[PDB]
């Protein structure tokens, strides 16, 4: 009943795993959101919102993450109909798929890169904060509003509450995966989001994912076809470490050499993304 008059539906922004997202107009402000249908029987996760409703995983993350300025797309609303959840997260504009972002432009120089990952730390870092592991931390998962430099993360369908005991569940793709799912299929939060970090580092300041096969993952080396910074490749490959334990924390991350000197948003925006 609210859904189609609050939101002026518009072109399909994206479909997959997710479900299918639109571009949408919240008539009452002039908006700009997107609009999240998720068909219930391909829901995996369920979870009760803290009012005692059933709702997807993704809501309960988001809702306890989309309090407060954070580098995530925040859930603005949400609707159950009969087979189907929409969610009203928030559509930056302009915007781009840090995944789309660096299969356009290559490589990223290590400034973009440091802006950018520094950005994605601060949003996992919020969600940690706010009891939430995203699991699918990817390119595709962080959006670029491009008039801001702003980094947002989305996609939380495939995350969690966080938890200091070990997971036995992951839905993201093999290549992003810790070695420690691969060889256990089990993994710890913190630690895990540490290599996807690893990961999507490399893919920044590389164009691409450092690892395709199960055997280089299990493997840990890793290999730079760019010119990548000797400190830069200090932290992928300790973000990398194969070793959960080994691998470092956000404050050890954020604290490393190569993540010194970060632009503010703004500025990479004006630097790099025009
Ligand atoms: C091919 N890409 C991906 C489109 C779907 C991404 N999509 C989401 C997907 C899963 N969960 C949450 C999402 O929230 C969003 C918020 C704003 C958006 C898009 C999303 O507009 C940006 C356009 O991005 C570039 C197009």
């Not at 994206?14 to 609009?35: E, K, M, Q, T």
């Not at 995996?44 to 709702?55: K, Y």
């Amino acid at each position: 009943e609210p859904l189609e008059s609050q939101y002026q539906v518009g072109p399909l922004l994206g479909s997959g795993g997710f479900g299918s997202v639109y571009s949408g107009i919240r008539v009452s402000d002039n908006l700009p959101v997107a609009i999240k249908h998720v068909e219930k029987d391909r829901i995996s996760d369920w979870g009760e919102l803290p009012n005692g409703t059933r709702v997807p995983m993704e809501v309960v993350l988001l809702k306890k993450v989309s309090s407060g300025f954070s580098g995530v797309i925040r859930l603005l609303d949400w609707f159950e109909r009969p087979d189907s959840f929409v969610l009203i997260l928030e559509r930056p504009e302009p915007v781009q798929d840090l995944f789309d972002f660096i299969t356009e432009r290559g490589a990223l120089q290590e400034e973009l890169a440091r802006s950018f990952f520094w950005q994605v730390l601060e949003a996992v870092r919020h969600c940690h904060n706010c009891g939430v592991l995203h699991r699918d931390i990817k390119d595709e998962n962080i959006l670029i509003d491009l008039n801001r430099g702003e980094l947002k993360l989305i996609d939380f369908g495939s995350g969690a509450l966080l938890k200091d005991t070990v997971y036995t569940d992951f839905d993201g793709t093999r290549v992003y995966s810790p070695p420690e799912w691969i060889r256990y299929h089990r993994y710890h939060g913190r630690s895990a989001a540490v290599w996807s970090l690893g990961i999507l580092l490399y893919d920044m300041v590389c164009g691409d994912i450092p690892f395709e096969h199960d055997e280089e993952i299990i493997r840990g080396q890793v290999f730079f076809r760019q010119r990548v910074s000797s400190e830069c490749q200090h932290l992928i490959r300790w973000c990398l470490a194969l070793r959960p334990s080994d691998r470092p924390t956000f404050e050890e991350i954020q604290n490393h050499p190569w993540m010194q000197d970060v632009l503010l948003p703004q500025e990479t925006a004006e630097i790099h993304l025009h």
